[PDB]
Amino acid sequence: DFDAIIIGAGFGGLYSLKKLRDDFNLKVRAFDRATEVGGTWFWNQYPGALSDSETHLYCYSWDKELLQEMEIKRKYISQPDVLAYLKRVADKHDLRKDIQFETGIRSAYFDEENSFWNVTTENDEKFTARFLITALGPLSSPHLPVIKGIETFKGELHHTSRWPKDVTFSGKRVGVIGTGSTGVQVITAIASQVKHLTVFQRSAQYSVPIGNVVMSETDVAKIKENYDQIWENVWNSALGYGLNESTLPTMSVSAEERDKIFEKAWQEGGGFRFMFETFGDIAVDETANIEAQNFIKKKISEIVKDPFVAKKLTPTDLYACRPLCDSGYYEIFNRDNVSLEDVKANPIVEIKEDCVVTADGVEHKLDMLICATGFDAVDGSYKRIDIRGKDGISIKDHWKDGPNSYLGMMVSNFPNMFMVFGPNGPLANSPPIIETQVRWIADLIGYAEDHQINQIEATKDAVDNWTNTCSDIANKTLFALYMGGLKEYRNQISEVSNNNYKGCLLKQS
Ligand SMILES: Cc1cc2nc3c(=O)[nH]c(=O)nc-3n(C[C@H](O)[C@H](O)[C@H](O)COP(=O)(O)OP(=O)(O)OC[C@H]3O[C@@H](n4cnc5c(N)ncnc54)[C@H](O)[C@@H]3O)c2cc1C
Ligand SMILES: NC(=O)C1=CN([C@@H]2O[C@H](COP(=O)(O)OP(=O)(O)OC[C@H]3O[C@@H](n4cnc5c(N)ncnc54)[C@H](O)[C@@H]3O)[C@@H](O)[C@H]2O)C=CC1
């Protein structure tokens, strides 16, 4: 029995714990299958895993001491460091004493008469708790790339989502399936170290340079000295990536101008930035979208010295969402021990003991095959848990037609359950969204303790409104889930919390 159960010990889990335990004095336990805190940063330790967000923003805001303390080696932070960082947050606030590691949750069924949650582990522990905090993140189970004959393969088959330790590249032919962000990081990291790399590319994507430089003692002092301002600007921005968000329209300058603005962002680095700090309409207007793409196509053709290769790396679709970030990805394809296989015009059909076979019957002989093939959507982490609310409805069935929430946090027919980095949340840097959501959830359970209430849920009506509020803003953009940003997200939930949780049925003891 607990005031609250937390599922997860990543960013959202760790803070949920700290806040509910130490700031609101609640009786709380946190669960994670992982042996250590960190979430995705414990699980994903492949070559080149790295924040998209800058080092000084990809962290908690609420411990001012730890900010002055924080190591800031590079502009962006490597997986080990993030894990060291969260590990050290656990150390400082002693949170592990209230985390059971190696302990998956199987089921959670809301008890309607005790107004609390029945949570049963995979081990078969039944714990009771008034409140359910799910911090499962946005990246669910990996994609299992159904490839005929994966069983026959007798070399190393590794998946980025479960990267083993003690992996050696030297002297080996290595295949990489996937050229989204994980696979670009993998390929950039390893192309230098292997005998031969084959990239199996299903869909060429746009990548810009990240520009992950070491941070001088002065650079780091400039950050620390003005850290309070840094955050206030994060809270007063759409993306919370510390960017001079632009309102300048793209086609409202010269071609020679536009060029030079893109070359500035490009020299600086970062995908958000190229897309939101150059101009203000790149995600909304098509001409602008096209202009942004053609800038990158141009870059691709300059860097990639072999035109036929440059061709295969060039996206073909009409409009471009967020570009990936890289650390010399396009450069990779110039080298003599890298080859690109367009696996949409020449797919993988079979896989024998020692090779991947594509459509034209070429046998790609590999010692090692790496799946960098991506994760399921937000709801997959939920749908994969036995979660049942009112009238024994399981989240599986309630969301069978796409995920839904109120404010990204609360679910209809699903009481005392509060989601962190949950679906229909804002598009922005992770740590600020998580802070925002945890603080808000904590205050509401605070309100609940003080107004002696014992049951909170969002209406079906509140939810659709919110589902609508996302579509209206969404359809104002090209992205053919909640946009309009963090600043306006934080407004929206303040408009709710200040109006006695409009759309939440607060039920009383
Ligand atoms: C390499 C990499 C770089 C990234 N860079 C950025 C970035 O720059 N900016 C950004 O905004 N985001 C980034 N992300 C994503 C984002 O910041 C992380 O996904 C975020 O830290 C998630 O924190 P979380 O605690 O909400 O969820 P997670 O960290 O995914 O933690 C969820 C935890 O819950 C546990 N869990 C789930 N289901 C169950 C269950 N049934 N039982 C028990 N435990 C369960 C899991 O073990 C997991 O540890 C990145 C992700 C990766 C992999
Ligand atoms: N930029 C960053 O710092 C990072 C961001 N992320 C987050 O995760 C998201 C992307 O996840 P990723 O793991 O990078 O990959 P992804 O989610 O883009 O994976 C899909 C890719 O895998 C390949 N693929 C999948 N199934 C295939 C099949 N059957 N045949 C051939 N190829 C196939 C395709 O090339 C495809 O582009 C990002 O949008 C971001 O939110 C994750 C890691 C690093």
Pocket test for ligand 1, best of 430, 434, 436 (most atoms within 8 A of CB): 430
Residue 350 has phi, psi (to 5 degrees) of -130, 170
Closest to 492 measured CA to CA, from 439, 444, 426, 434: 426
Q: Number of C-alpha atoms within 13 angstroms, CB side, residue 178?
A: 21
Quote the tokens at residue 272: 């958000």
Alpha helices in 138-285 (DSSP H): 181-190, 217-225, 227-235, 255-268, 271-274
- In whole angstroms, what is the distance from residue 183 CA to residue 370 CA? 9
Distance 10 CA to ligand 1 centre (A): 6
CA distance 299 to 301: 5
Q: Are 507 and 455 in contact (CB under 8 A)?
A: yes
**Up-side HSE of residue 441: CA atoms within 13 Å toward CB?**
37
Q: Decide: helix, strand or coil at residue 121.
A: strand
Q: Which fold has domain 2-37+95-141+377-508?
A: FAD/NAD(P)-binding domain (3.50.50)
Q: Whose CA is nearest to atom 22 of ligand 1?
A: 137
> What is the structure's resolution, reported in angstroms to one decimal?
2.5
**CA angle, corner 306, sides to 339 and 309, nearest 5?**
50
Question: Which of 258, 239, 262 minimizes the C-alpha distance to 249?
Answer: 258
Which atom from ligand 2 is nearest to the alpha carbon of 177? 32
CA of 13 from ligand 1 middle (Å) equals 9
DSSP string, 140-175: -SB-----TTTTT--SEEEETTBPPSS---TT-EEE
SS3 178: coil
Exposed (0-12), middle (13-18) or buried (19+): which is 171, by Cβ within 10 Å? exposed
- Of all helices (H) and strands (E), which one includes residue 455? strand 453-455
Measured in angstroms, how far is the CA atom of residue 39 from the centroid of ligand 1? 5
Residue with tokens 């939440």: 504
Instruction: DSSP letter for 392, please.
Output: G
Structure-determination technique: X-ray
Distance linking the first and last C-alpha atoms of the chain: 19
Q: Judge whether 393 and 457 are in contact, CB under 8 Å.
A: no
How far is Cα 2 from Cα 26, in angstroms, rounded to an integer? 8
74 and 139 Cβ atoms separated by less than 8 Å: no
Pocket-forming residues, ligand 2, beta carbon under 6 Å: 50-52, 139, 143, 145, 177-182, 201-203, 325, 343, 372-375
Can you list the pairs that 334-337 forms with residues at least 24 positions away whose Cβ atoms lie under 8 Å? 334/303, 334/304, 334/305, 334/306, 335/191, 335/192, 337/191, 337/194, 337/195, 337/196, 337/197
Residues 6+ apart with CB under 8 A from 292: 250, 262, 274, 275, 278, 279, 282, 320
Q: Give residue for tokens 């589902």.
A: 467
CB 410 within 8 A of CB 418: yes
Q: How far is CA 73 from CA 77, 82, 222, in A?
A: 8, 12, 14
Which atom, in ligand 2's list, is nearest to the CA of 201? 35
Rg (C-alpha) for the chain, rounded Å, is 24
Written as one string, the DSSP assignment of 48-115 is T-EEEEETTTSS-SS-HHHHHH----BSEEEHHHHHHHHHHHHHHTT-GGGEESS--EEEEEEETTTT
According to DSSP, the β-strands at 410-411 and 363-365 are unpaired
How many whole angstroms separate alpha carbon 122 and alpha carbon 33? 9
d(C-alpha 17, C-alpha 100), whole Å: 12
Give the ligand whose atoms come closest to the C-alpha of residue 325: 2
CB 471 within 8 A of CB 427: no
Smallest CA separation from ligand 1 atom 23, residue? 11
What span, in angstroms and rounded, lies between the C-alpha atoms of 75 and 416?
Answer: 40
What does the alpha-carbon distance between residue 440 and residue 429 come to, in Å, rounded to a whole number? 17
Q: Give the CA distances from residue 327 to residues 93, 185, 187, 218, 442, in Å, rounded to whole numbers and listed in that order.
A: 35, 8, 10, 24, 39
Using CA atoms, how far apart are residues 434 and 31, in angstroms rounded to an integer?
18
Distance CA 467, CA 481 (A): 9
The token duo for 360 is 């034209």
- Is residue 465 classed as helix, strand or coil in its secondary structure? helix
Q: 350 C-alpha to center of ligand 2: Å? A: 22
**Amino acid symbol at 61:** S
Query: Would you call 362 helix, strand, or coil by DSSP?
Result: coil
Which atom of ligand 1 is nearest the CA belonging to 182?
Answer: 1
Angle, alpha carbons 199-202-204 (nearest 5°): 85
Q: Which residues line ligand 1 (CB under 6 A)?
A: 7-13, 31-34, 39-40, 44, 49, 51-53, 58, 79, 104-105, 135-139, 381, 385, 420-421, 429-430, 434
- Selection from 335, 272, 348, 271 nearest residue 309 by Cα: 335
Phi first, then psi: give them for residue 349, nearest 5 degrees: -110, -35
Ligand 1 atom with least separation from CA of 122:
42
The residue contributing the CA closest to ligand 2 atom 8 is 181
- Cα separation, 99 vs 13, in Å, equals 10
Which sequence spans correspond to the domains of the chain? 2-37+95-141+377-508, 207-371
Helix axes 430-450, 11-18, angle to 10 degrees: 30
Closest CA to 388 of 164, 174, 110: 110
Q: Considering every ligand atom, which ligand is closest to the CA of 184?
A: 2
